[PDB]
Symmetry: D3
Subunit: 316 residues, 6 copies
């Protein structure tokens, strides 16, 4: 084939070998890849239960359990395109602004090379430096799976950058197109009598958990696809969209959430869209249980990888 | 506008502050409040896996994650009515009858002041002294979420007070109207071929787990609303109604239970009933996993708080 | 009416007593029982995450929670037939072939006595020696719940015996009738774009997780029954069929799985079939969380026991 | 020598077999044994963190790791005398007074048969009913390893029976001889500014943690042997004597404790005394980490078994 | 005493009541107290494994186990002086400088009122704003128990503030007298071929783990007392001085440490010094096991409280 | 200063980067290195509690906390010699003899290149193939830290290869000189009166735990050095030598063991000896607690590395 390949499991047992994403070779140069698997070990944007800085290491670890071919779509992503583990974006645990700069820097090297990034957080603030690099020319659409909109304004006085502000920033900076943004799974007590105010004024489509239950998977999918249409789309997967039973290891859980099953069905349903990048954020190992949330992370990573592979091929 | 409010999360982070229910101020006088949040740290009635005496503390802890406004109903409970943390009902861990007296004494003051109690257990026996305080004037109706009927007679072999007997006592003492009692979620193997002896003979509506699946949420909700009518009604939520996946921290789990999502749907559907009190019972921290069951309790508590707040508002 | 009985829970509490299956007496002679509860503490067939050798002990422990009478069917299994704990099948943790030899040996003694076996694993390889003893005369039909087909050929060279090959082996050896085999819950990424090859060629009905969801419980059930028919049938239950939310303590978890509730419904729907034995495999205590998987295992064990008790009852 | 033996580890691996104490056969008749291994699954005496009721079960489990011969003394207890698992003493989890009565009942049957008990608690109150059976003829001496004196008077009013009063009761009842009591390891903040008042009035030798440190093992032992002399002596080992690092699974930890090493040395040095019984109490699985404390419990149990075996052989 | 007192355990069980340090009443005004118990829930200075922001809440929880009187020195701190829970110092989880400013501001009020602070972190950076409030008039002496000197210069560029720089800052700012600073337990691999460069150059007495082992407790103590003399001294206790076995719940563990016992002996031996404040830092619940480190923290707090109370009593 | 270096911690934080031993670069060619860090993830030799196959991945993860310079000895191993991560020796989870051949194959290539191996298991059986490669020309001496002598003969019939036989095999194969072999820490009950036969009859120096305590660290060190002399010597460090308090994550724990501190003092005292290689074995993640034992493994690995670096430097 000649593409980078995972360590062969008929030969090296899955517990063995240096833990890389999907057991792929490590790369330093983004031009060597069509899809780059990237860690963003960064949780400076976390105002309560931190720990998502350990997400990437543990996702790497549990991705050992992933196999080469998707059993539904039959996509063999490593055969389709050049995929590899591109390491961790530079992070500064003590300096939020420095991290923001340096992560953007890293991502514009990735974008300049033409690689589609598949990223593991890190809390949800990580998605902003990524959009800063990927949405310069044209604004992005987005399918966003989350318990929270992450479109708040300020925290603890007037700090504009937290894991709860990234999509407001991205919209203000013109990186995210709100008319092509759909959010799925929003739930839990809120600060305000009309929380979806910013959302409604700029026209974000918010499918709350309760609307997702009313609609069902198919109708929700039809509505997500309708919102993003034909244009360049990013997929942001916050593991907190899932119920705590499936994703305990997360900073801001809200009970009464999506099932793993349902998340796989929704992601699988995005086949054919022009996906320009994706992430899996908020995996927090210090609140995780037997690496349950790290495994969810790894699997959802692979689900997204398969579709990114197809978009990277189409884009070539 | 002058009601007790949670600590301001724009000022004081959720990991900070001495931990009270919902970050509310502590109160000793129930006349200061319309809805009172009360712990009953008591498990003297547990015949197997104990630890529910630690429930109220961990629920307080995890309730730090609750916010001011319900996202569906828009109810802002601390603006509608005055809510506060009344601390723990006094408990004697070595003397069961002394606990029964003292817990009731506490609830007697709460009832005299006209305050609706919202309680956290404690095993299910804690509901009895509450009913003894709350049901003397007219027998209460009840919506009861549980895996068990808790209507047994005697254990080992002349003891009338366990977590399995509170509602038999309540019916015998004329405090609980069985003809206005609905039990939802009952499941798990039983001791003898006829479990439902007492339950059927006094006319309790028992919606077993199986019937609840046949029925679905909306029809169950309508049957529960039919049974309790326009009369004064108590809501008892036993976390063991949930599947262990959502609530592992409980003494007597039975697999194949309710989802947190389903529980929220069913409790929200109780809107508008004449609710005179409610509790969340059987959270047992020594069997809990990373505060999961404590978070469930805290959230279900917030769900009940909203409905209780509306009742207390209608009374004023 | 002189049948072996569980310890009397109205006199001896569930935390007390030597842990045997279902708190029953221990037996060493299979002819003394119609249904024998057997542990197969064996995981030499495991290629990655091991630990199922500890399964039977923890299932013994957690089976303390089971009661005497099924609450839906009203089957009192210990009244219907003679049930007991037959101990553990002989295992050599260090010699795979010797274990196969000895496990088969033990199971032919069980078979020669007309005792129906209900077995707790152990990884899925355990089912092969059992099959070699139960299917010498006439091949078995099977209802198989798993995340994996376990019909692979070879591993790490020319090794034909792992937890992923037992049903391929059983079919080749004429012990399992593929035309009377249905498999339910298969999911997760695979090694090749053509995985169901062996299954499609010999005619195994494979119901993947995706098809189970499209089908629903009742239609899945009718299909399962259509496949096995009136003939002699084994039920093999691998806990990894369950979403890791319900069964974390297993070696090869795959997300987006079956709920505990669904498994109960599906197993309960096998009533009336000519069931000649069953097993519950792949419970791995070292990856379990507070015995949840061991509890699930004990419960499924009770569910199967009821059905088997009905089968043993019919014969005389 | 025709004496009961553990399952053969050279043949049956340690993860296998029904979990009895030391993998010994189970007995019903005390007269069949010279040393009886007994569980007392009782924690009605616990006023704060409970769970010791599950102690005997988890100790049975982890005793699977024990071997047949002591590596220092070379005592082979099963060769010397007849040892077996006598099951659990009857317990009433709801009724304290009924428990005391039924446990005594069980122990006087054990005593009437000339059988030396080796008991696993259960909280410390469990030793009282044992002393009530064993202390009738001559009052007993004791070497007692604990963080607390367990010689308090009343709790929560006029309650004379908790895990903190057994030894005061036993002295008042003339079952324990204070002049022949030595207590080793006492430490931790106290309620009373003069806590040791009772112990000093009746002449109990109290070697506090601080004094044990100054004395060292050899000299502490000389002093413990002096106190108990040649008379009949019980050993009561409370795991909370150990530092929480070695025994986390206990209800009332006090840091800065004894090491497992030190405890082994101290018990080993009691060889040659007339030991008429022993217990290991306060193992609390709900607060345990990976069965650490259960293992400690099982090992100390074996340490004592060897000594009790020598005393039993001496008498016969 | 008329002094504030812990909840009466003879009446109120230790698992009940809204949890405060040592079960004392909650205070808002530092002039009401002679020793103030304060939480600094702050870990913005943490460069790797964080979580210490949850320290104060869990130390509060586990301090429920503390009793009224020290069992060795016989000091009863609450009878000696007025002690209370002052709550948490204000903390900004996003703005490091804003926290430094606000924490100091809180301690300024505390110091102005003549109140002696006993603090629970939070990571070690938290000691800097404390020193900033306490060491302006005259520089402080210090006994510092730690695995690390915390006298490094810069991190990740020129960030002057981390858990590893605070004492470097305090010396530079004239708040700490290096000549009256002694550090005990220092150990672990270092970044650079010469580490104690700064510490030796300004003349801090550094007693590495190895020297403490050679010296022994008494001789270590005599050296520490020689260093601090008769002048005003602060005691800063980093739980990571302890072996991971005694304190697993900490961010930067180094194996082969001090035991709880040794730590208690070293603190007890500080009796009679002019102690003006103390802290217990680096308790990190997300890495803790069953609250082990919280309990150590709570107990070391009590050890420190007893001596602080005597100092405050001398002054009065 | 052209040697391989760990990721720069002033630039790249410890939670970031692909997890290699000590965050060194990954090598594939042994000839590139003077000291080779190797994982041997193999537990086929385990007769009871397995999981050591996961040892090397977790030790890699936690080795992230190691720094560049030994604080006592001042050895900067990466400046001294060329050190790197050689990956994992090949392993067949299902085939013991093939693992034996293939692991030896790998170490043969390592030995041919002049590279000193520093290895992480895997269970203690992993040392045999290592010795088979390193001990042909002349037999090795050994310092061996363990709770067990690992010189048993056969298990479960005649299987000559388990984690309890490696040194029996190595001695019989002329690879280990028993007259230059010292074992330290041996303890715990034994299977029969005469297991120890082999070790004494061939003259291994066996320093039991009891004797180690009698001798003390310094005299144990003197005796270990006397046994090995100036000849080529291997160090085999089994984490089960440590008390379970310090090393919970291990398959066959024996309470009453060495402390982390003692182990460090002992290994550090091996400076100057002709060390030809070392290993750290029996780290078993499925039994570890928050990675405690992996961290111990990582530190002991660093301690050993520093000494190995000196040996490599002298040869060159
Ligand atoms: N929520 C599912 C993630 C997988 C956890 C399984 C680990 N045994
Ligand atoms: N299932 C209830 C909530 C559990 C999530 C807790 C994450 N720490
Ligand atoms: N105190 C240590 C007892 C043993 C723990 C080892 C792993 N279960
Ligand atoms: N001198 C003891 C050093 C401990 C090193 C750090 C281990 N994690
Ligand atoms: N190392 C002190 C903590 C003790 C833990 C016991 C149970 N929380």
């Amino acid at each position: 084939n000649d593409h980078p390949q995972p360590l062969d499991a008929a030969e090296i047992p899955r517990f063995a070998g240096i833990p890389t994403f999907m057991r792929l070779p490590a790369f330093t140069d983004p031009a060597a890849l069509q899809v780059g698997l990237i860690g963003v070990p960064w949780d400076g944007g976390t105002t309560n239960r931190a720990g998502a800085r350990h997400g990437p290491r543990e996702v790497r670890n549990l991705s050992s359990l992933m196999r080469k071919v998707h059993h539904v779509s039959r996509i063999a992503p490593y055969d389709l395109v050049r995929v590899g583990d591109l390491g961790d974006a530079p992070v500064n645990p003590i300096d939020l602004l420095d991290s923001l700069r340096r992560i953007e820097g890293f991502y514009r090297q990735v974008h300049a090379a033409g690689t589609l990034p598949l990223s593991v957080g890190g809390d949800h603030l990580v998605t902003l430096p990524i959009f800063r690099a990927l949405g310069r020319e044209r604004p992005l659409g987005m399918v966003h799976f989350d318990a929270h909109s992450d479109t708040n304004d300020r925290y603890f006085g007037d700090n504009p950058y937290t894991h709860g502000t990234p999509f407001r920033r991205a919209i203000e900076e013109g990186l995210l197109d709100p008319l092509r943004t759909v959010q799925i799974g929003i739930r839990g007590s809120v600060y305000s009598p009309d929380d979806d105010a910013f959302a409604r004024e700029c026209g974000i489509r918010v499918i709350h958990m309760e609307e997702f239950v009313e609609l069902g998977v198919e109708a929700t999918l039809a509505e997500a696809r309708r919102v993003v249409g034909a244009g360049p789309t990013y997929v942001s997967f916050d593991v907190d969209v899932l119920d705590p039973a499936f994703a305990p290891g997360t900073g801001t859980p809200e009970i009464g959430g999506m099932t793993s099953l349902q998340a796989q069905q929704l992601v699988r349903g995005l086949r054919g869209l022009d996906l320009v990048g994706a992430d899996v954020v908020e995996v927090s190992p210090p609140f995780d249980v037997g690496g349950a949330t790290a495994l969810v992370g790894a699997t959802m990573m692979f689900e997204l990888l398969c579709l990114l592979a197809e978009s990277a091929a189409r884009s070539a």
